[PDB]
Amino acid sequence: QLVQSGAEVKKPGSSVKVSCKASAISWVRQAPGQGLEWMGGIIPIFGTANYAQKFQGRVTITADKSTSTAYMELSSLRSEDTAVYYCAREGGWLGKPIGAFAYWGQGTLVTVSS
Amino acid sequence: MEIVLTQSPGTLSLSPGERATLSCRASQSVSSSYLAWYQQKPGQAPRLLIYGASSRATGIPDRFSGSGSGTDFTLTISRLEPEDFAVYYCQQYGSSPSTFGQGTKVEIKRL
């Protein structure tokens, strides 16, 4: 069960911070006319962030282990960052390797408006 | 180098009852056929349909199937139901970072 924070409207060049409460996720956005893109995620075992090159240097992904909550903070927002932002999880694992996302949050719309 | 996934066609225009076949081409071979397909309808999160190129997720209807290996993959809907008009995405997880195609919209064909 993944439950995300509410929609946000942001000004150009500002930063947004979205939360996802699990009841090691990834952040994937759906940006109009660009399909889905993987931004980054908290990795298994180490519980630290990895990032896509495209967003490296203005995305910060953190997790609060105690509250089972992940965050994505995206800075220097541009009009092209208008998108629905999802947290997603794959699902000790001793079965076959499987890196598909079975579980998704409800999405957080971020609109960057001038 | 990220594996780039390119879906075809951009838009598929068909009538209910018709067969739909969606293509996903990878810029580089996708290890171990680690390819997934999702459906997304407006206002909803993506839903996992297929993983490992050809394995149907539990609760996904028989009319959905997937096939392919290397760089060429397909999702087929054997007969389109009204609820199947949606956008479909492929995803590879055979290499880091995971990447997605741009989506194919399956829409109702003009009258």
Please answer yes or no on whether A106 and B36 come within 8 Å at the CB atom: no
Using CB atoms within 10 Å of the CB of residue A67, give its burial: 0 to 12 exposed, 13 to 18 middle, 19+ buried. Answer: exposed
Q: How was this structure determined?
A: X-ray
Distance (Å, whole) CA B68 – CA A46: 33
Q: What does the DSSP assignment read for B48-93?
A: EEEETTTEEPTT--TTEEEEEETTEEEEEESS--GGG-EEEEEEE-
Distance (Å, whole) CA A7 – CA B67: 37
Query: Which A residues, 32 through 61, put their C-beta within 8 Å of a C-beta on chain B?
Result: 34-38, 50, 52-53
Helix (H) or strand (E) holding A36: strand A36-42
Q: Does B39 touch chain A (CB under 8 A)?
A: no
Helix (H) or strand (E) holding B20: strand B20-26
CA A14 to chain centre: 17
Resolution (A): 1.9
Which CATH architecture is the domain A1-114 placed in? Answer: Sandwich (2.60)
Domain B1-111 in CATH 3.30.465.10? The answer is: no
Which sequence spans correspond to the domains of chain A?
1-114
Which sequence spans correspond to the domains of chain B?
1-111
The alpha-carbon gap from B78 to the nearest alpha carbon of chain A, in Å, equals 23
Distance (Å, whole) CA A89 – CA A102: 6
Q: In terms of Cα–Cα distance, which of B7, B10, B67 is closest to B35?
A: B67
The number of C-alpha atoms within 13 Å of B11 and in the hemisphere containing its C-beta is 6
